[PDB]
Design a protein around this ligand. Structure first.
Ligand SMILES: Cc1cc2nc3c(=O)[nH]c(=O)nc-3n(C[C@H](O)[C@H](O)[C@H](O)COP(=O)(O)O)c2cc1C
Ligand SMILES: Cc1cc2nc3c(=O)[nH]c(=O)nc-3n(C[C@H](O)[C@H](O)[C@H](O)COP(=O)(O)O)c2cc1C
Ligand SMILES: O=Cc1ccc(O)cc1
Ligand SMILES: O=Cc1ccc(O)cc1
Lengths: 176, 176
């Protein structure tokens, strides 16, 4: 409405993830920045999803979602997920759906990690629904997390501005 | 309880922010990874805070908080915020509290950005409270956001493993 840099930009750069929803013929994927962990034990996550997203419809329908973690190498698939709508986009995507362990929603095999979630809350704040999901299963690529921490060579993906992305430095600073 | 890499590590690396709470004598700061935007218009944020944090007490008391954005250069102050407890830590911190525009909670002048929040919800999920706040005012450093986007030279801070941190590459990938 009022040109200027919107206030949400102050939290950026933010990690970019993929959200998978539905199953079989209805299987969808969208990009999502607005994701965070909300509890350590039980493991619970949340994602802000606008009502207008096909992903919002599929999450409400089935009560499950998958957070797949993409690398910088699949930015093209990530961009499609973030720009096109609903399950027909998968026919432009370089992605392989594999079953998941506890949700019906599929996982993305190229993903660094897939986090399988059962929805336990849905609150409305402003123009998005915050979908809170209990992590009931997870898979990942061993090298991307080899020392029980994230391996920075794996090219974890972040978002700076609308069409611009970056990964992390490989230079680590120790706090103690 | 069961040694192994905990499931929350799969979302990492995550941005690290500071949370400011209370005012005057009660002014506190803690580190917080688990922060995300939940709405664009109105601008609304959320932060997962364990009940055991002094910050949890101060947020419930006053209903306000500030998300300050730290750079890699102040990792030492950030580590103190994330390791010590309650307002006495400020006497080890290289930080200058300045007033805020709409909350009573102060801002951190060295911060790349301070995001002034009025609490509008508090839900409990697992071992944390998710504090949802309406952004009612904000300030930032112009060079850190010079092109209306984040300036990567500013050294935005991220968290890889318990005591390890990194910033972003300055190398930008265009998605279109
Ligand atoms: C990097 C990036 C991050 C995004 N993050 C979110 C998000 O956090 N929440 C949201 O509702 N939409 C987000 N979007 C928008 C959706 O990904 C995009 O609108 C998508 O076309 C919706 O697809 P769908 O209708 O198939 O679900 C994002 C887009 C991009 C490119
Ligand atoms: C990098 C980092 C991130 C942190 N993130 C969070 C968080 O998201 N939520 C939380 O409750 N505690 C978090 N903590 C823990 C608090 O910052 C830490 O326990 C602090 O000592 C609590 O201080 P207080 O008791 O003065 O509030 C984090 C600590 C570090 C070092
Ligand atoms: O760019 C990130 C983004 C977040 C939420 C949206 O609704 C759309 C885009
Ligand atoms: O390391 C990040 C962190 C998040 C939540 C906590 O409660 C403690 C630490």
């Amino acid at each position: 409405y009022f040109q200027g840099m919107e206030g949400y930009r102050l939290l950026y750069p933010m990690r970019t993830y993929l959200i998978v929803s539905g199953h079989g013929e209805e299987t969808n994927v969208m990009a999502a920045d607005w994701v965070t962990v909300v509890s350590f034990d039980p493991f619970i996550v949340g994602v802000a999803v606008a009502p207008k997203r096909t992903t919002h419809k599929l999450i409400k329908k089935y009560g499950e979602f998958v957070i797949s973690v993409p690398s910088l190498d699949v930015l093209r698939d990530v961009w499609i997920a973030g720009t096109k709508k609903g399950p027909s986009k998968l026919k432009e995507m370089s992605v392989t759906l594999i079953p998941s362990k506890k949700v019906k929603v599929p996982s993305i095999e190229e993903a660094l990690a897939n986090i399988e979630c059962r929805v336990i809350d849905a609150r409305s704040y402003g123009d998005h629904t915050f979908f809170v999901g209990e992590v009931v299963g997870y898979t990942y690529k061993d090298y991307a997390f080899e020392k029980g921490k994230p391996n920075l060579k794996a090219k974890f993906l972040a978002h700076v501005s609308w069409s611009e992305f970056v990964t992390f430095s490989e230079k680590v600073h120790k706090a103690e």
